[PDB]
Amino acid sequence: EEVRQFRRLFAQLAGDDMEVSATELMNILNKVVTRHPDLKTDGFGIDTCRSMVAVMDSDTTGKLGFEEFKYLWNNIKRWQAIYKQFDTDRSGTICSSELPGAFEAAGFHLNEHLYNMIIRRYSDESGNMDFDNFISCLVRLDAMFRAFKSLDKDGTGQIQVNIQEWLQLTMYS
Amino acid sequence: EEVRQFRRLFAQLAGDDMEVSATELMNILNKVVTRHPDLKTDGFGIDTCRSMVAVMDSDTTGKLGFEEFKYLWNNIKRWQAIYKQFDTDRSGTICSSELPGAFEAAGFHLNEHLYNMIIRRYSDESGNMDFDNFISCLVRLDAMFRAFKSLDKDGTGQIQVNIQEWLQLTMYS
Ligand SMILES: O=C(O)/C(S)=C/c1c[nH]c2cc(Br)ccc12
Ligand SMILES: O=C(O)/C(S)=C/c1c[nH]c2cc(Br)ccc12
Ligand SMILES: [Ca+2]
Ligand SMILES: [Ca+2]
Ligand SMILES: [Ca+2]
Ligand SMILES: [Ca+2]
Ligand SMILES: [Ca+2]
Ligand SMILES: [Ca+2]
Ligand SMILES: [Ca+2]
Ligand SMILES: [Ca+2]
């Protein structure tokens, strides 16, 4: 019944326009995090969810269709399990000492410099990251690796991006 | 006096660490918009302000020093003026039809496709944009032009980046 239950979840969440908006996404994430007192969060806010939608909206409809939403949801299901596992003291938050192992478990092997930038952008003044910040960072990180991979057809590890493409990739994010 | 008053504003806003954080920025922007009822807004949120700080934080300290803050504030001043001037129907919001005129006044000449993305990302279902979303969009857009230019000295309209560079550019934003 897994396929069936999920199609049902998408149908009811997407509603009358058959796609998942930022508001719909915000609502479901917040509902689910209500049941997980181990995930400390101030909530998923609408601007975070608009960025989430835009980076996952690869056909540029403004909203998440079934396959887009399925990809996002399955990544979050995995990433939440990682966050719980790497929260090796039950603060409910991922501190700087815990972050590299968490990201590496998700398949993101970054260097100290990158980890440092991520912490400045997504963690608080103590270096702790809450759950909605952790998911919004990973959704973006995954999308940016995928964008790079899409543009590096020749597998040279360098991509050439023109201004139109630069603006599209950065503004619709 | 302008010079003197502004130093006082920065000093009081930045407080004990001598730089302006995202929280401090959020608090001043919200205090200031409330005195401009001709600028409609649901408020500036913390995630939006973290994004604003990141794109304005040229020396990667995590927070805005005096010249970074001055740059941002002077832009906001100019853009709020444009907002009021191009809200021709006096709605307090900038609709899809008013947007190009506003953006052209701010010096940006974008193609249809990129307006469509911007409206999807920043406007409401009707295509109307409130003031915090307009400012957030402009801050970002100005920054993204500046970043590309700083990397494309000889105006080829293309930059070349490796994965490390790409992630630094896209995740610290
Ligand atoms: O604990 C579990 O078994 C599952 S399947 C967790 C989640 C599955 N989807 C999630 C979304 C958010 Br938001 C937080 C937690 C979950
Ligand atoms: O209209 C004016 O005279 C000025 S000094 C406007 C502003 C100058 N800085 C601002 C910040 C926000 Br938020 C809203 C309005 C302004
Ligand atoms: Ca819907
Ligand atoms: Ca879509
Ligand atoms: Ca922890
Ligand atoms: Ca948060
Ligand atoms: Ca400060
Ligand atoms: Ca700085
Ligand atoms: Ca208007
Ligand atoms: Ca808004």
Residue numbers in the entry:
A (entry chain A), B (entry chain B): 96 to 268
Paper text:
Calpain-I and calpain-II are the two most studied members of a family of calcium dependent cysteine proteases that currently comprises fifteen identified gene products in humans. These heterodimeric proteases are composed of a large subunit with a molecular mass of ∼80 000 and a small subunit of mass ∼30 000. Selective inhibitors might not only be potential drugs but should act as tools to explore the physiological and pathophysiological roles of calpain-I. α-Mercaptoacrylic acid based calpain inhibitors are potent, cell permeable and selective inhibitors of calpain-I and calpain-II. These inhibitors target the calcium binding domain PEF(S) of calpain-I and -II.
The interaction of (Z)-3-(6-bromoindole-3-yl)-2-mercaptoacrylic acid with human PEF(S) was investigated by single crystal X-ray crystallography. Human PEF(S) was produced in E. coli, purified to apparent homogeneity, crystallised and soaked with 3 as previously described for other α-mercaptoacrylic acids. With the exception of a hydrogen bond between the carboxylate of 3 and the side chain amide group of Gln175 in chain B, van der Waals forces are the main interactions observed between 3 and the residues of both monomers of the protein. Based on the X-ray crystal structure of PEF(S) bound to (Z)-3-(6-bromoindol-2-yl)-2-mercaptoacrylic acid, oxidised α-mercaptoacrylic acids such as 4 were designed to target the full calpastatin binding cavity.
